[PDB]
């Protein structure tokens, strides 16, 4: 199954087809992704388990509208399924408890008066939507893998990884996971953090003369792609 | 491909009561040919989707081999109370049932073609860093066209050669369980699957299982009586096991003596598969190169005489 669309396709999602404002859907995905990130954090979940649920969440709304399916209910269902897939399972009851603590009275209204049944029913739909393609990999894996092949100042390289890690967490609030493979995202956040800290990442590679250091990690990726991914991440902080 | 189709499968009859749901026999309307349907219900459980089924699905999508049961598709019925169905390629018989009846006896060339397919499947699973962890005569599926597939990947898990992985002790079930597990090993190797196949290899020549006990202590004694007692000379790292001094049965390895009828080339494999020390035991890749299976050309083999019941 192919899990990657282009921006033209992202401008024609089932949500926007029902007349939803493209800027509002972007907001709904931010709220939803950050929701899964928050609930899972308070339950002390692996950083991959969080990202797994978010990718389920993003993929779900490529086939379903936000006007038909409440985001916080879907996110809770994604986190629940992700816990079993990544084998760090949490009781569905305890997810709702965490959800009630984070959400206000209006937001929690999406779960109705019986949140458990509302989430359990949705799981049958979620599995069908993701076509039982449960296993997913995230930029975190490749971020550490690529950074462990850089010869240079241990202090500067360490800082590069920290900032890059933050940018990966931010990219999960975007549709980037639906756009590019994790290997590319892992590179892009290194590219961004490198440009911000004025780090010459090439000077840490086997070929310091070559300027496109990333071509030893990912194949056929123009600088336009990396630059584009940066701008999608940077506009999160923008207002 | 997308996996969310309605049951366009005409059900023939119930096969049995497998894990988390009955297993039906059917044939799809479009393609044709037979298909096994493992039913998974949601209305029974607060597990939502059963996690045990999740691991099986995650593994089968990544195992694509001629001698491994491959999951074809996942279908549905259609706030509903529905159920999912795992689609598997149908196999007519299993090795246990064929041996239960006194009807089927296998030639030397049948066993060769069978052990070949079985170990060729394990090498694929072991190279993909997967432990079967439940290999037995019943979990080996055989059809009427000589083809053999390994099934039941529920208790399967991922393996790391970095030895940074302590797993579950209660594995393989008692009869086919390796000596390391019976002594309390938790950080083991794919060699536990090889021991099981060794217990199956000997089973084929003797029609009945070679180690049958009700207690775990008793099981160790049966292995000891034939393979020899766990001595440090034969097995140096046996002292590092929790239940070593508490489960002492000494016995001389009379394996070749009690399997004299078995061909010399065949007994060489059975001897190396059933060695106590896991580190000093044949692997999957090694067993496919022994005298009893190196020259076995599968395409030159004739199908068995399996009767339809």
Author numbering:
A (entry chain A): 22 to 260
B (entry chain C): 719 to 796, 804 to 974, 977 to 1036
Pull verbatim passages from the article behind this deposition.
Mass spectrometry revealed that many of the expressed CDK12 proteins were mono-phosphorylated, whereas the shorter construct CDK12715–1038 was essentially unphosphorylated. However, CDK12715–1038 was phosphorylated in vitro upon incubation with recombinant CAK from Candida albicans. Crystals obtained using the non-phosphorylated CDK12715–1038 protein exhibited multiple lattices and could not be indexed. However, diffraction quality crystals in the monoclinic space group P21 were obtained when the same complex was phosphorylated with CAK. In the more truncated structure, the electron density was most complete for the complex comprising chains A and C. CycK (chain A) was modelled between residues Pro22-Gln260 and the bound CDK12 subunit (chain C) between residues Trp719-Pro1031, with the exception of two regions of poor electron density between Gln797-Lys803 and Lys975-Lys976, respectively. Similarly, there is very poor or no electron density for AMP-PNP in the structure of the shorter CDK12715–1038 construct, further highlighting the importance of the αK extension. By contrast, the complex comprising CDK12715–1052 exhibited a 10-fold reduction in activity, while the activity of the CDK12715–1038 truncation was severely diminished.
Human CDK12 (CrkRS) and its close homologue CDK13 (CDC2L5) are unusually large CDK family members (1,490 and 1,512 amino acids, respectively) containing a central kinase domain with flanking arginine-serine-rich (RS) domains. Recent work indicates that these CDKs regulate transcription via assembly with the 65 kDa cyclin K1 subunit (herein CycK). Ser2 phosphorylation is required for transcriptional elongation and is performed by both CDK12/CycK and CDK9/CycT (P-TEFb; the positive transcription elongation factor b), which are identified as orthologues of S. cerevisiae Ctk1/Ctk2 and Bur1/Bur2, respectively. Here, we report further structures of CDK12/CycK complexes solved in the presence of AMP-PNP and containing variable truncations of the C-terminal kinase extension.
